[PDB]
Design a protein around this ligand. Structure first.
Ligand code: NA
Ligand code: NA
Ligand code: NA
Ligand code: NA
Lengths: 223, 58
């Protein structure tokens, strides 16, 4: 998260830190959010061989009693996910068991097409600058939903599928490590951090949750 | 695992990309979900998407 501020600890209790393993080599990291006691939502590009979810975290580098660490038992990557464009960058993760509801750990269950112009908030543990390490602490930033034309330079960007996020005149943006995290508008999850420019210049591209709601509903009803 | 080698340099344009140089070697983590492949660089240990036509099996 670039240009943001440290979250009040545990103020965003749905936030999930994902550690994604592949055999031998080092693991990779993403964000996510708990939408049901045993389901986390995140980006499809965060998939891998096995995933561990940490809930209840603020400083992710220091274990504490609020933490709940759960193994993923099933990954539901959107079946139309395309790596060249990152279209349909959305995945549901089924956890091995239910999380406990505490002050630090809670769900953000879903309650319309969100138009350009509103202010929204995104949180994550990603880099705080192009060459910065991942953030020890959960950060958040307030970002403007832009007209889809503000994302024209990503030729494959599709307003029906994706949100264009972050006033290009500012430095505020989600960045590497924030992928999978939720964009909340008036308290409702409306986007998922997907990708942006290598130089971190906003806007970045988020998956538009509204388009995928039927698919999400389908996976939840059957699992 | 079979290794892949870069045939050209590439500079990332999206943060989900890897950058790389001709000669760099990779393990392919996801080459089955589109024409960009999720790869791990044996030089850097970083993971990201690369255009599939920029590499060949070692
Ligand atoms: Na394509
Ligand atoms: Na439980
Ligand atoms: Na477009
Ligand atoms: Na990477």
């Amino acid at each position: 998260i670039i240009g943001g501020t440290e979250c009040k600890p545990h103020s965003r209790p749905y936030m999930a830190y994902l550690e994604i393993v592949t055999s031998n080599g080092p693991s990779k990291f993403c964000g996510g959010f708990l939408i049901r006691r045993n389901f986390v939502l995140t980006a499809a590009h965060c998939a891998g061989r096995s995933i561990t979810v940490t809930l209840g975290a603020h400083n992710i580098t220091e274990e504490e009693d609020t933490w709940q660490k759960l193994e993923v038992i099933k990954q539901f990557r959107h079946p139309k996910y395309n790596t060249s464009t990152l279209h349909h960058d959305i995945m549901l993760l089924k956890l091995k068991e239910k999380a406990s509801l505490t002050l630090a750990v809670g769900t953000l269950p879903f309650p319309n097409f969100v138009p350009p112009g509103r202010m929204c908030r995104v949180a994550g543990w990603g880099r705080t600058g192009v060459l910065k390490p991942g953030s020890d602490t959960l950060q958040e930033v307030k970002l403007r939903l832009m007209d889809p034309q503000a994302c024209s330079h990503f030729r494959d960007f599709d307003h029906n599928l994706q949100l264009c996020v972050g006033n290009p005149r500012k430095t505020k943006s989600a960045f590497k490590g924030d992928s999978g995290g939720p964009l909340l508008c008036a308290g409702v999850a409306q986007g998922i951090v997907s990708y942006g420019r290598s130089d971190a210049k906003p806007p970045a591209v988020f998956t538009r949750i509204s388009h995928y709601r039927p698919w999400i509903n389908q996976i939840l009803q059957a699992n | 695992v079979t290794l892949f080698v870069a045939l050209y340099d590439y500079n990332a344009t999206r943060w989900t990309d890897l950058s790389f140089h001709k000669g760099e070697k990779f393990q392919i983590l996801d080459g089955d979900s589109g024409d960009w492949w999720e790869a791990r660089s044996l030089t850097t240990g970083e993971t990201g998407y690369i255009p599939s036509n920029y590499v060949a099996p070692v």
